[PDB]
Design a protein around this motif. Structure first.
Motif, PDB file in Angstrom:
ATOM      1  N   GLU A 153       0.822  -1.207   0.000  1.00 14.48           N
ATOM      2  CA  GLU A 153       0.000   0.000   0.000  1.00 14.48           C
ATOM      3  C   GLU A 153       0.858   1.260   0.000  1.00 14.48           C
ATOM      4  OE1 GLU A 153      -1.589  -1.125   3.784  1.00 14.48           O
ATOM      5  OE2 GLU A 153      -3.624  -1.441   2.990  1.00 14.48           O
ATOM      6  N   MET A 154       2.089   1.157   0.493  1.00 18.04           N
ATOM      7  CA  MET A 154       2.917   2.340   0.689  1.00 18.04           C
ATOM      8  C   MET A 154       3.356   2.958  -0.627  1.00 18.04           C
ATOM      9  SD  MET A 154       2.871   2.694   3.945  1.00 18.04           S
ATOM     10  CE  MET A 154       1.271   1.943   3.862  1.00 18.04           C
ATOM     11  N   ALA A 155       3.428   2.167  -1.700  1.00 15.36           N
ATOM     12  CA  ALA A 155       3.768   2.742  -2.999  1.00 15.36           C
ATOM     13  C   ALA A 155       2.725   3.772  -3.405  1.00 15.36           C
ATOM     14  CB  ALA A 155       3.883   1.632  -4.048  1.00 15.36           C
ATOM     15  N   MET A 156       1.456   3.507  -3.058  1.00 10.37           N
ATOM     16  CA  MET A 156       0.373   4.428  -3.390  1.00 10.37           C
ATOM     17  C   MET A 156       0.424   5.685  -2.532  1.00 10.37           C
ATOM     18  SD  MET A 156      -2.671   1.526  -3.432  1.00 10.37           S
ATOM     19  CE  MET A 156      -3.661   2.510  -4.514  1.00 10.37           C
ATOM     20  N   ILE A 157       0.830   5.548  -1.267  1.00 13.65           N
ATOM     21  CA  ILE A 157       0.857   6.680  -0.344  1.00 13.65           C
ATOM     22  C   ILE A 157       1.792   7.791  -0.830  1.00 13.65           C
ATOM     23  CG2 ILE A 157       1.233   7.346   2.070  1.00 13.65           C
ATOM     24  CD1 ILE A 157      -1.165   5.539   1.731  1.00 13.65           C
ATOM     25  N   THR A 158       2.792   7.466  -1.658  1.00 12.15           N
ATOM     26  CA  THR A 158       3.689   8.501  -2.180  1.00 12.15           C
ATOM     27  C   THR A 158       2.924   9.600  -2.910  1.00 12.15           C
ATOM     28  OG1 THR A 158       4.088   7.447  -4.357  1.00 12.15           O
ATOM     29  CG2 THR A 158       5.564   6.834  -2.528  1.00 12.15           C
ATOM     30  N   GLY A 159       1.774   9.267  -3.502  1.00 11.73           N
ATOM     31  CA  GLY A 159       1.067  10.176  -4.382  1.00 11.73           C
ATOM     32  C   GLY A 159       1.515  10.140  -5.826  1.00 11.73           C
ATOM     33  N   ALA A 160       2.553   9.369  -6.152  1.00  8.32           N
ATOM     34  CA  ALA A 160       3.120   9.358  -7.489  1.00  8.32           C
ATOM     35  C   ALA A 160       2.802   8.099  -8.282  1.00  8.32           C
ATOM     36  CB  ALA A 160       4.641   9.531  -7.409  1.00  8.32           C
ATOM     37  N   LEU A 161       2.029   7.173  -7.735  1.00  6.85           N
ATOM     38  CA  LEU A 161       1.733   5.933  -8.449  1.00  6.85           C
ATOM     39  C   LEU A 161       0.484   6.146  -9.299  1.00  6.85           C
ATOM     40  CD1 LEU A 161       2.860   3.082  -8.836  1.00  6.85           C
ATOM     41  CD2 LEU A 161       1.096   2.300  -7.252  1.00  6.85           C
ATOM     42  N   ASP A 162       0.682   6.286 -10.605  1.00  7.51           N
ATOM     43  CA  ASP A 162      -0.425   6.629 -11.488  1.00  7.51           C
ATOM     44  C   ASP A 162      -1.308   5.433 -11.808  1.00  7.51           C
ATOM     45  OD1 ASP A 162       0.318   9.426 -11.777  1.00  7.51           O
ATOM     46  OD2 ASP A 162       2.138   8.602 -12.749  1.00  7.51           O
ATOM     47  N   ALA A 163      -0.731   4.236 -11.881  1.00  7.59           N
ATOM     48  CA  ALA A 163      -1.517   3.035 -12.131  1.00  7.59           C
ATOM     49  C   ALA A 163      -0.889   1.850 -11.422  1.00  7.59           C
ATOM     50  CB  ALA A 163      -1.647   2.720 -13.628  1.00  7.59           C
ATOM     51  N   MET A 164      -1.749   0.911 -11.043  1.00  2.66           N
ATOM     52  CA  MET A 164      -1.354  -0.374 -10.473  1.00  2.66           C
ATOM     53  C   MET A 164      -2.095  -1.440 -11.275  1.00  2.66           C
ATOM     54  SD  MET A 164      -1.982  -1.816  -6.603  1.00  2.66           S
ATOM     55  CE  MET A 164      -0.779  -0.884  -5.675  1.00  2.66           C
ATOM     56  N   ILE A 165      -1.354  -2.226 -12.052  1.00  2.55           N
ATOM     57  CA  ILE A 165      -1.915  -3.174 -13.010  1.00  2.55           C
ATOM     58  C   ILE A 165      -1.817  -4.567 -12.403  1.00  2.55           C
ATOM     59  CG2 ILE A 165      -1.826  -4.035 -15.380  1.00  2.55           C
ATOM     60  CD1 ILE A 165      -0.316  -1.465 -16.105  1.00  2.55           C
ATOM     61  N   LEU A 166      -2.971  -5.205 -12.175  1.00  2.11           N
ATOM     62  CA  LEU A 166      -3.088  -6.408 -11.359  1.00  2.11           C
ATOM     63  C   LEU A 166      -3.494  -7.607 -12.201  1.00  2.11           C
ATOM     64  CD1 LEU A 166      -5.392  -5.008  -8.564  1.00  2.11           C
ATOM     65  CD2 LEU A 166      -2.897  -5.052  -8.617  1.00  2.11           C
ATOM     66  N   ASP A 167      -2.916  -8.770 -11.850  1.00  2.00           N
ATOM     67  CA  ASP A 167      -3.327 -10.055 -12.399  1.00  2.00           C
ATOM     68  C   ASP A 167      -4.032 -10.857 -11.317  1.00  2.00           C
ATOM     69  OD1 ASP A 167       0.007  -9.971 -12.343  1.00  2.00           O
ATOM     70  OD2 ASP A 167      -0.686 -11.907 -11.591  1.00  2.00           O
ATOM     71  N   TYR A 168      -3.314 -11.603 -10.477  1.00  2.00           N
ATOM     72  CA  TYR A 168      -3.892 -12.329  -9.353  1.00  2.00           C
ATOM     73  C   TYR A 168      -2.820 -12.708  -8.351  1.00  2.00           C
ATOM     74  CZ  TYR A 168      -2.978 -15.991 -12.930  1.00  2.00           C
ATOM     75  OH  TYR A 168      -2.415 -16.757 -13.935  1.00  2.00           O
ATOM     76  N   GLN A 169      -3.273 -12.921  -7.104  1.00  2.00           N
ATOM     77  CA  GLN A 169      -2.545 -13.467  -5.961  1.00  2.00           C
ATOM     78  C   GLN A 169      -1.750 -12.398  -5.221  1.00  2.00           C
ATOM     79  OE1 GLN A 169      -0.141 -16.783  -7.306  1.00  2.00           O
ATOM     80  NE2 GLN A 169      -1.845 -17.622  -8.496  1.00  2.00           N
ATOM     81  N   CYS A 170      -1.968 -12.288  -3.906  1.00  2.00           N
ATOM     82  CA  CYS A 170      -1.152 -11.517  -2.966  1.00  2.00           C
ATOM     83  C   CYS A 170      -1.404 -10.019  -3.058  1.00  2.00           C
ATOM     84  CB  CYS A 170       0.330 -11.858  -3.129  1.00  2.00           C
ATOM     85  SG  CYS A 170       0.624 -13.606  -2.846  1.00  2.00           S
ATOM     86  N   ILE A 171      -2.470  -9.608  -3.726  1.00  2.00           N
ATOM     87  CA  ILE A 171      -2.880  -8.215  -3.830  1.00  2.00           C
ATOM     88  C   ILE A 171      -3.857  -7.901  -2.702  1.00  2.00           C
ATOM     89  CG2 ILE A 171      -3.997  -6.504  -5.266  1.00  2.00           C
ATOM     90  CD1 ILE A 171      -3.225  -8.843  -7.558  1.00  2.00           C
ATOM     91  N   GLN A 172      -3.466  -7.038  -1.781  1.00  2.00           N
ATOM     92  CA  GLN A 172      -4.366  -6.629  -0.709  1.00  2.00           C
ATOM     93  C   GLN A 172      -5.552  -5.902  -1.324  1.00  2.00           C
ATOM     94  OE1 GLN A 172      -2.405  -4.392   2.496  1.00  2.00           O
ATOM     95  NE2 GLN A 172      -0.592  -5.701   2.356  1.00  2.00           N
ATOM     96  N   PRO A 173      -6.793  -6.360  -1.109  1.00  2.00           N
ATOM     97  CA  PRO A 173      -7.916  -5.661  -1.752  1.00  2.00           C
ATOM     98  C   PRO A 173      -8.130  -4.250  -1.243  1.00  2.00           C
ATOM     99  CG  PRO A 173      -8.729  -7.419  -0.330  1.00  2.00           C
ATOM    100  CD  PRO A 173      -7.235  -7.603  -0.440  1.00  2.00           C
ATOM    101  N   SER A 174      -7.501  -3.887  -0.125  1.00  2.00           N
ATOM    102  CA  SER A 174      -7.508  -2.501   0.316  1.00  2.00           C
ATOM    103  C   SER A 174      -7.004  -1.532  -0.754  1.00  2.00           C
ATOM    104  CB  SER A 174      -6.611  -2.365   1.539  1.00  2.00           C
ATOM    105  OG  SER A 174      -5.289  -2.726   1.172  1.00  2.00           O
ATOM    106  N   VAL A 175      -6.187  -1.995  -1.707  1.00  2.00           N
ATOM    107  CA  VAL A 175      -5.671  -1.069  -2.711  1.00  2.00           C
ATOM    108  C   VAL A 175      -6.801  -0.334  -3.435  1.00  2.00           C
ATOM    109  CG1 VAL A 175      -3.434  -2.278  -2.954  1.00  2.00           C
ATOM    110  CG2 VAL A 175      -5.327  -2.802  -4.551  1.00  2.00           C
ATOM    111  N   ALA A 176      -7.950  -0.987  -3.643  1.00  2.00           N
ATOM    112  CA  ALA A 176      -9.042  -0.345  -4.373  1.00  2.00           C
ATOM    113  C   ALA A 176      -9.646   0.815  -3.597  1.00  2.00           C
ATOM    114  CB  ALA A 176     -10.132  -1.365  -4.717  1.00  2.00           C
ATOM    115  N   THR A 177      -9.648   0.748  -2.263  1.00  2.00           N
ATOM    116  CA  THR A 177     -10.162   1.844  -1.448  1.00  2.00           C
ATOM    117  C   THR A 177      -9.118   2.945  -1.274  1.00  2.00           C
ATOM    118  OG1 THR A 177     -11.514   0.256  -0.199  1.00  2.00           O
ATOM    119  CG2 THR A 177     -11.238   2.437   0.743  1.00  2.00           C
TER     120      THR A 177
END
Ligand code: SF4
Ligand code: SF4
Ligand code: FES
Ligand code: FES
Ligand SMILES: [Fe+2]
Ligand SMILES: [Fe+2]
Lengths: 634, 634
Positions: free
Chosen positions: B314-338
């Motif tokens: 989640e911390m990569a997103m907290i920077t404010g600079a992550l424009d996209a996160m491209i997901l396939d499957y496994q080990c993705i915290q669903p909190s990323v969507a919120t």
């Protein structure tokens, strides 16, 4: 007060015996578990990774969400999907076993097995597109077995034990939503993947996956019935008895328990050959009796009497007269291995993947089936000898049971009223109101519900309202043990219109009396027989299953297999009652999908209702809504 | 005090930012879950039927047994088996996806994919017995893909991605115990069946089933690596960077997250073609960075820098600079969507069976891979434009990372010291003591353990004792982010004997310096690469794997996949440390089997140890016991 535990009087009598002897029962282990965890009861618990266990308070403050961010609706849907996959893994594993048995039989590797129903073999081949003209039966069967095994994995076609058994219009509805399974074990594995941590996290998407996996379960059920009928014969009407009074103090009493007829069918035949060996030991003979679905299989095909079912299975041992309990897999309380130390019963496991600590294991192999059966039955005879001079307490309680109503048998019975259009007499009497609709009772007993109370309460209300009632598994077990399969009870139980129809069919079949109040369609895999009947009616009428006045009730459900069956009943288009709470109430969104918005996808829906009088009213309302949708009075 | 949450300083800085901004993190959701349920923690909870939930008190009075009679040892073993099956379902589903991709590529149905490593294709074909002489490459590949798919179901051979990748003597040991899988999805389904209610109820029998299913997981891992190498190239040594400082305020930052290179490999190539389109939008270009295993895949093959891993994603997103996160499957915290609603990041799902409510879904299809990639990257460019003029907080923290040590690359590096016997220089230095043994670090981070603390504490103790350390997954992630993949740290970290060996190899490969302190062998499926290396050493020495001084450590394990990997490490013969408690301690008999008596079956065993200093001592003792068994000083 044993009537709070079971409404079966023979079970009550054995509960009194277990109590005075200090033998702990399933009901005692339930009492010791109270109060049960409310996170688990509501579905708001997750153990899908080592950061857990996680839980969510149904109401109040934190915790509100899983550690990874999984919401209540994700956690609830993932747990439910895993339960569906586990049920699918049981019904289809059963089917896979029978496919390997048929292949071995026709390759000359297991001469105790053979093509017994050539008519069924040829009809299945035709349904699948396998050529029969100018082919040897053994080659046709080999192709059928290979097609069965191929449905477990991806290939150039979808699962044919789905797409060839439902009407094209239903297949089209399901295909439009992506719900047709690609392979049976493929879907089971996909479920386990998508529900693992950090994968699928959208309730609707998860539940669509569950519906598809439930159809993989249906395919395993239908494949199991098809293959068992080829190998062991398609059932036809038969008369026998049920309840603990079918045990005989003077005989070697052998229960077959578990699921697969590959085991129980041979025991039945070999036991007849060993009568003189049993007499040499001081017995009158070998008395094979049934428990659970394996019992249903041999009751349907051979009239073997049913001893007991599901939740009350330990009570057969409490009599003191059960010399052996021969087990395959599924629905066997592992307590039987400990209770045997008290009662003297020899508990014998036979399958490599289903052992119980403390029980004797005798490896079954199809290639050695007769020899393995004799080894098992000789352990039983030795056990009978050890109880020479011991009094037993067999409750003198049994009912008459007419059963064997495969779909082929139901069609044949109707054909005596209309030879070239056998379904029409049934449809005619739905239209004129003599038959209000059809209800399938399916699934288990559950220690939370006084044994049989929901099945009998609901069935009585429906029968008085002229509903044709069919039953499988331990729902058939409950109804048979309370007299619902004895035609002598038609006058007391059935509305006048239903009585008139059951009487006309029975007398046209020569019985001089009616069919029984409830039609026994067989084991849990044989829920597929009800699908075959309903699909044939849909095809005859030119409508989809979600327009027919047909409902299902898993009135006392327990096993993951019963969750899978309930889910495919919804998926094929039926209003489906469940009489115990599945672990869904912790998520209103999930509950709303399963009880309401799934109607817009498949036309079916769950009816969750723990009060049986209310459940009967809701089932009748569902039937009557379907009648009105067809323009019929109700 | 953020160092109690993570030992990574960039993560600490983002935790401070999340706190002042009111953004809830995985660590906050963990705090809100305390105290966690001790029935679940110990494994003494069962929800396998609707009579549950059942629980057993670890100590004291009732409840002592499940309602059906399931004992503590049955309940614990069944839950563990389901976790192994779920891990197997993830690694092998990944592999199945890649098999379908290869088949499509060589049938002309997906021209964005191709045979990139022809050498690997031909070696795999030879290993499997597939003829190559006079065959077109596309036909060889089609046969390889078909063999991969065939290993998912029963057939005339066992799973070849087990039996062709371990030495014959190990296959023989496993066969004698019935542990060779018959089909990958077949074993997953069998587990779900045998662990369902009223089936397998013997702890040893259940656990043998689990060991066999763990080998189905190994097969999926090895198949995944093989197929990814064919399609995308076998890794060789490469230099890049890791940690949040690899993000660039001036660029479109795109994280690839999840697992399968079928997705991340195309994003990498297409992103280069879209540089001018990104410049038109005011960016300097597209900066693709990695999270979790998909990140490892593109780091190993292309040197794409790794942003973060596992628990800190989640911390990569907290920077404010992550424009996209491209997901396939496994080990993705669903909190990323919120969290994306707060940070501005566009979270994009791409796989039909892995969706997250609130995230944008863009169906990926191999047949349209380039067009789908451009649609995704254009969403990212649009998001970059929306943050024009917004300050960001990218911690200016990164490490140098040398990686790309496939087994082929390790053999080639050693061949510079002995061209015709490349494994001998490694063996020579094990014998003379310059290398004490080998330790593989594998698996996840876990919120229960201060992030990276076990991996780094254990690795330091082993490196000072001259252990050659290799790493995969988020164990490689932990070690890379703390400098263990920078050869400049060899002097500080490595014992003199290990330094001498790393220096001799590195200088013989022209580096003028040593190999890095730890060798990065790739993603979680690439644990199979460590198997290939260890099997090659066993074959060169004429001994089985359970005689080699090789150990594994899942020091901060989380996912069901990590349980499966740990279990197959034990099954192939390795002492295997796990640094978090799996749900087994509620049953002493089960714990004793997994930590002791399994040694007599496979030669491996679990070492459960939550204190990392003690774990390092126990791992060194395990290595030294193996040395003494070979007659070596220690
Ligand atoms: S998957 Fe998520 S909700 Fe489930 S145990 Fe793991 S962290 Fe908790
Ligand atoms: S399988 Fe047995 S222990 Fe598990 S929930 Fe059901 S009754 Fe309880
Ligand atoms: S908290 Fe009781 S079922 Fe998990
Ligand atoms: S009682 Fe808490 S995990 Fe079930
Ligand atoms: Fe059953
Ligand atoms: Fe991973």
């Amino acid at each position: 007060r044993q009537n709070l535990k079971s409404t079966d009087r023979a079970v009550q009598q054995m509960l009194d015996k277990a109590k005075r002897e200090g033998i702990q029962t399933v009901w005692d282990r339930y009492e010791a578990m109270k109060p049960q965890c409310g996170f688990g009861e509501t579905g708001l618990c997750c153990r899908h990774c080592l950061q857990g266990p996680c839980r969510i308070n149904p109401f109040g403050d934190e915790p509100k969400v899983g550690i990874c961010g999984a919401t209540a609706e994700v956690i609830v849907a993932r747990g439910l999907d895993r339960s569906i996959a586990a049920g699918a893994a049981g019904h289809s594993g059963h089917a896979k076993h029978l496919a390997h048995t048929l292949k071995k039989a026709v390759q000359g590797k297991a001469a105790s097995y053979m093509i017994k129903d050539r008519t069924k073999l040829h009809s299945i081949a035709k349904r699948l597109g396998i050529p029969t003209e100018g082919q040897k039966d053994e080659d046709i069967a080999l192709e059928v077995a290979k097609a069965a095994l191929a449905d477990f994995h991806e290939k150039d076609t979808p699962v044919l034990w789905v797409t060839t058994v439902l009407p094209p219009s239903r297949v089209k509805v399901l295909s439009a939503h992506g719900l047709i399974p690609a392979g049976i074990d493929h879907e089971i594995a996909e479920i386990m993947h998508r529900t693992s941590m950090g994968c699928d996290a959208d309730a609707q998407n998860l539940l669509l996956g569950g519906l598809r996996c439930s159809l993989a379960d249906l395919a395993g059920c239908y494949m199991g019935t098809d293959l068992a009928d080829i190998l062991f014969g398609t059932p036809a009407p038969v008369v026998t008895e049920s309840n603990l009074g079918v045990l005989k103090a003077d005989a070697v009493n052998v229960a077959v328990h578990g699921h697969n007829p590959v085991l129980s069918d041979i025991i039945v035949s070999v036991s007849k050959e060993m009568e003189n060996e049993a007499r040499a030991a001081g017995a009158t003979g070998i008395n094979v009796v049934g428990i659970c679905c394996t019992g249903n299989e041999v009751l349907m095909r051979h009239g073997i009497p049913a001893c007991t079912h599901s939740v009350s299975q330990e009570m057969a041992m409490i009599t003191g007269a059960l010399d052996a309990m021969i087990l395959d897999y599924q629905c066997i309380q592992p307590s039987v291995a400990t209770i045997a130390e008290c009662t003297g019963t020899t508990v014998i496991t036979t399958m490599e993947m289903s052992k119980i600590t403390g029980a004797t294991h005798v490896n079954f192999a199809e290639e050695a089936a007769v020899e393995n059966a004799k080894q098992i039955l000789r352990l039983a005879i030795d056990t009978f000898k050890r109880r020479k001079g011991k009094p037993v307490e067999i409750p003198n309680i049994k009912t008459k049971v007419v059963a064997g109503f495969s779909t082929e048998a139901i069609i044949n019975a109707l054909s005596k009223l209309n030879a070239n259009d056998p379904l029409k007499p049934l449809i005619d009497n739905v239209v004129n109101g003599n038959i209000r609709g059809v209800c399938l009772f399916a699934g288990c007993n559950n220690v939370k519900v006084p044994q049989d109370q929901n099945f009998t309460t609901i069935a009585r209300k429906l029968l008085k309202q002229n509903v044709l009632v069919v039953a499988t598994g331990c729902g058939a077990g409950a109804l048979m043990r309370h007299g619902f399969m004895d035609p002598a009870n038609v006058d007391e139980l059935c509305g006048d219109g239903l009585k008139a129809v059951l009487t006309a069919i029975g007398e046209a079949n020569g019985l001089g009396g009616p069919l029984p109040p409830v039609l026994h369609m067989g084991s849990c895999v044989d829920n597929s027989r009800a699908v075959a009947l309903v699909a044939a009616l849909a095809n005859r009428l030119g409508v989809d299953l979600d327009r027919l006045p047909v409902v299902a009730s898993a009135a006392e459900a327990m096993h993951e297999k019963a969750v899978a069956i309930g889910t495919w009943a919804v998926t094929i288009g039926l209003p489906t009652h469940i009489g115990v709470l599945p672990p869904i109430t912790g998520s209103l969104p999930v509950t709303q999908i399963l009880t309401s918005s799934v109607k817009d996808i498949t036309g079916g829906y769950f009816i969750v209702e723990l009060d049986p009088e209310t459940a009967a009213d809701k089932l009748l309302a569902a039937i009557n809504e379907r009648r009105a949708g067809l323009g019929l009075p109700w």
